[PDB]
Amino acid sequence: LVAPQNTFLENIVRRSNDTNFVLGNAQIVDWPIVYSNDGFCKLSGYHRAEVMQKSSACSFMYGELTDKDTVEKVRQTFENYEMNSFEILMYKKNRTPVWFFVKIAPIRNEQDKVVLFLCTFSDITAFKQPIEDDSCKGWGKFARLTRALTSSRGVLQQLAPSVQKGENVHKHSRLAEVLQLGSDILPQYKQEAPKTPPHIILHYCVFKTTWDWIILILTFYTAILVPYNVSFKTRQNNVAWLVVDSIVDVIFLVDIVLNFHTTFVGPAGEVISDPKLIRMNYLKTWFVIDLLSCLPYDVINAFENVDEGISSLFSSLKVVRLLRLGRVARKLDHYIEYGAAVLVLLVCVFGLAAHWMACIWYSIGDYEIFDEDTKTIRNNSWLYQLALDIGTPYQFNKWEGGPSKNSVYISSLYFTMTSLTSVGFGNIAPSTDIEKIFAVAIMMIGSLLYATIFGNVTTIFQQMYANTNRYHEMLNSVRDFLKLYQVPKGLSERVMDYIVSTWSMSRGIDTEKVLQICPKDMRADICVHLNRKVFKEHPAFRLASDGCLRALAMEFQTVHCAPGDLIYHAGESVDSLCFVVSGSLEVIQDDEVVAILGKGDVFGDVFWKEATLAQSCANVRALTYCDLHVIKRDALQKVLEFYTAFSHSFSRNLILTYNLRKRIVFRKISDVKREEEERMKRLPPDHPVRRLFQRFRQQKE
Amino acid sequence: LVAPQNTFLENIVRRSNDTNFVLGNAQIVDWPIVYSNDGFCKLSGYHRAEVMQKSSACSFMYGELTDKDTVEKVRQTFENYEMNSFEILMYKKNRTPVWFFVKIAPIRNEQDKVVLFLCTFSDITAFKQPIEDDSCKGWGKFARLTRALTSSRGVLQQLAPSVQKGENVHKHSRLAEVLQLGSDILPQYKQEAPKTPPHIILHYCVFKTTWDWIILILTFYTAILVPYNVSFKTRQNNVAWLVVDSIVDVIFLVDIVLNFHTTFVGPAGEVISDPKLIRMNYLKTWFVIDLLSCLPYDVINAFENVDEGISSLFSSLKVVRLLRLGRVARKLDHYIEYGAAVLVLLVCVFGLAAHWMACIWYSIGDYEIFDEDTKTIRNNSWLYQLALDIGTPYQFNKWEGGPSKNSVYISSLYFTMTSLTSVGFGNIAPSTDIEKIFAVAIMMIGSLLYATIFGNVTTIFQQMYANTNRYHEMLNSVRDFLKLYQVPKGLSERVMDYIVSTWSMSRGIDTEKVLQICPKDMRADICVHLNRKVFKEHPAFRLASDGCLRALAMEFQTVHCAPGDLIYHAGESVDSLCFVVSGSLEVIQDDEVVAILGKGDVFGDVFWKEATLAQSCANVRALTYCDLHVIKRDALQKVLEFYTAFSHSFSRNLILTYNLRKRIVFRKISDVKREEEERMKRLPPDHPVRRLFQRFRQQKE
């Protein structure tokens, strides 16, 4: 976990080595000071807050003895961007003059430009011509001046009292640290990556990734071949296996050496790349184990024809080559997390265990069958029962070969395989004490490993089907509720269809939760992108600043309306401007069509001007699958009143397509025709309606 | 579950035994009264509220007959801290004089000091010289005085009327209870631990813990050896087993005895340590069972050579030694909770059941094989089939020994093992009716136990992988959302990287939930520790009291910002002071660097002075992995206005590094150079811009 980060301050403070620095801007008139340091504030007496936003020429610290020639030099060097180091008397808060040495070194940028200046400071007050302005005593002023040069008097020039005429080297010693700032100028105020130290290969590189698989394949091959070779009485009539063994040893030794020069993930951190402790970590962790596993003890003895005693006993222990599984033990944490890879690992270890146990079974049978000097055939042993069953039984003149190795290995593997899988055909079965003990052990191991496999498979299935079961349960609950509360089909069908359709599109994701997971800036940018369709299109938003745009994108809400669904029923309070972005809607007023809205149109009421709620005067109905972007009145009013400059143009530029509060008046053709027909066929006691007419006239007046 | 608690009040009220006491302070002038009692208030007529904060010399209760000599005695004893008991006439609310006896006994402290006084009270009005001030009648006053001495007239001195001249012992009887207060003075007002009663060993001690494992090992050994010994016709040719059996019996009897003197966890409480019922609990729970299991019935009969009839029948029942599993039945609740220990327990019980069933199988075979007086060999039995298969078949001259016990036991164990593991090689198989019935039983038991093992393994795997599956599901949901809503890669990469990185560091812990779980004081202290980095460092907080410090630590929030993430975009409302504690940030104004912030710097606006919101005038961008401590404006204003004294120094001491509301003005070198170049190359109808200039001048005026 590493990101491209600007390492300006860290590198500069590490490389300063008990010095002081002030950063200045390079592209502004008079070069305002952009940063100061604790050492600078301590030496000058000026606080960082009161020294910020000051000219980098340090004119704020000038006085009587400052030289116009020095002013010219600093100005010309600043305007020329050249490395230089001056010494000029400077003035602190109390105006008391003290000698001073300076050095200026601007730093470039990755885009081939100069952005930041850097002026360093040094004190030579105790090692220059003594100058005083107003002090109680000359020696007192000298002591005061000397008390400020602790950095110079320290280990930087601690050998000065022990020697004489050291001024010829004190300046060089002081400037040596300052000249190192070019090393910290290498990032050049840019997103410099964490470059690795030389002769170290990152462990997430392509080469390392493709090497790990080869090392795993080779360790698998050696784990398979070692017990077979050690137990099945195989001969060395085939030389090429020795050559392949030698190449295997070479590859493993090369990997062992390469494990020194490779970064590793630190348990107490994230990434460690320090060669002074990487090698120590590897050596203390696994180097001894891998080296002892990676040496062919018998190879040298066989090549040199050593004595058949202690040397042969040492050589015969090549079973120790099996512990090469340290590589797999290391690697298994890379892919142990996957649900579906643990099953493959378990199947592979099942097969490997089957091979090992079959090899042990042959070893037991071969140790058992003969009776050594007793010359008894021991017809009890399975290795004789199989020789009788399969054909070519034993005979003597020396004893015959009986079964061949090719069939013997397959038979042993079949027996171990049936024992592990717990099928148990039993045509080959243990018969003596040692075989029976081994049988008890093998049944126990097989039962446990089978339990592990079954557990893993059940976990995979359950974690696969949990989500579908949850969805089905929710649907069943909704159906049961709707059946219980006697809701008719005309609404039940719509509810079930809406639930099914919304699940089909939204899948198992919650937009609110996804938004809340991310931080604030990510939330802002995601919302701005989601409402880009309205923002870029509608002309009323073309004069929006970043802050108001984000504050509006936070509140804008997207609503999907299916055809047939009403949005604003007649008489409902209207409190939300809504921009149509897709599909089309219509407005119905007194069971008639009075306007039709399409893409890029907004309908509602002018909230910031009306400042009151009104009843909706017409119904709005969906026609096609539309997308709406509604915004509540309160949030819009708050944002608009916060951004007065934005409002002064928003009010002028936003014109509503249809205003819901206002309603139109009109007459019907059928109504006027009926009125004319009635008039074609055309009160003294009408006191109540006379009073009604008088009241209506008074109200209209 | 016991904690170090001060048992002052509980012990003193238990030991008072129907008396009264008033606690007084020992390190304050005039010794204000720190606590009173119901008995004291009832007898004196003064309420606790109106008697608190009064001199411990009881001068508030003095009157005419109080003696200056008694005042001198009480003062000198109080200043000398000495045990003493006086009697002096005291005055109640109605001023009526009544005789009184007092005793003062200060109590020390664990730090070798005196902190609390203790003055006891007693009434001797009815047993002293009668004194009256103003009463209706002498006998009436006598009755009134006698009516107040019920505590003395009770069982404390109930034998006084039955005897004469009892005043010589009444004082001793009254003082005996008061003198016991030294026992309650033992805690000395300190965190006294709940010391155990003598001759009782706590059951969570090291000795008990290390003894439990030994008793479990020995019960396992006896459970393994008992059925083998009882069934396999083993002989006593090896004496040492009898000695080991004797030592086993001694150890178990010692454990049985030791179970009397050991505290046990009470089901209806937490810890019970009362010896008068601990022994009863053990006896009613398991003592009879353990004692009957822990006696070698046959040992005494064998040693004494008892008759081979009823005594031998009694002795032959040593199978009853098997019920020693009561210890494991008790103990299994200690380690039943662990998920990974139930598997080991199940494997052990599997092995033990296998051994038991193999022993039963041998018993059945040996009972079956021979036909008793019929002399029939019964070639059907497995114990003859095995003797034919393995070699050395039976022969007669008496009948031959056939197979040896060493092979017979292994064969029986192998048969039971295959039956239980459900492998079923079948080279040894039941052949008669009894064997077939036992086979049906053994298959059923094996199937059920195998089911239990598989269930346990599946539960372990699922509970191991649930968390990883949940994390993967959440990541997949976020990826699916981002794919659905067409967000570009430039934002998708950042979102996915943020989620992965935040999970990597935070693991599966929610800071808000962890905070909410704990109580209020723990929450406050945890928050104070979490913000210690700012609190101890920033000088503006060096004058903070406990209440304001906690009220600020409750609202301070920690924010981790990755490099490249913006915090305050230009034009956004600024409402939060934020202290930088690690890394470094920069402020960008008009695409330029104007200030740089490091460790121990704060940027925002002076809320308590401005009392209004302002638009941010510059962008702030992260450079390195930084930690921010932001605080909202409302909470800070509320706390500051609550703590006026704290505010009067906070405003003076807090100086902002960069003020976002304030914005600096400047010119660019390129801009001024271009302006000069344009000027080097250098209106009557300009009425609109003349009007613009006039309006600008009017606005500036």
Author numbering:
A (entry chain A), B (entry chain D): 10 to 406, 412 to 696, 704 to 722
Text of the article:
Here, we present a cryo-electron microscopy (cryo-EM) analysis of the mammalian Eag voltage-dependent K+ (Kv) channel in lipid membrane vesicles with a voltage generated across the membrane using K+ ion gradients in the presence of valinomycin. Four voltage sensors inside the membrane regulate the gate in response to membrane voltage, while four calmodulin subunits in the cytoplasm regulate the gate by closing it in the presence of Ca2+ (18). Voltage-dependent ion channels contain structural domains called voltage sensors that control pore opening by membrane voltage.
The fourth positive charge, R4 (R336), occupies the gating-charge transfer center inside the membrane. This region of the voltage sensor is formed by F261 from S2, which caps the top of the gating-charge transfer center, and by D264 from S2 and D299 from S3, which interact with the side chain of R4. Farther toward the cytoplasm, R5 (R339) is proximal to W295 and D299 in S3, and K6 (K340) is near D221 and W222 in S1. The pore of the up conformation is tightly closed, as expected of Eag in the presence of Ca2+ and calmodulin.
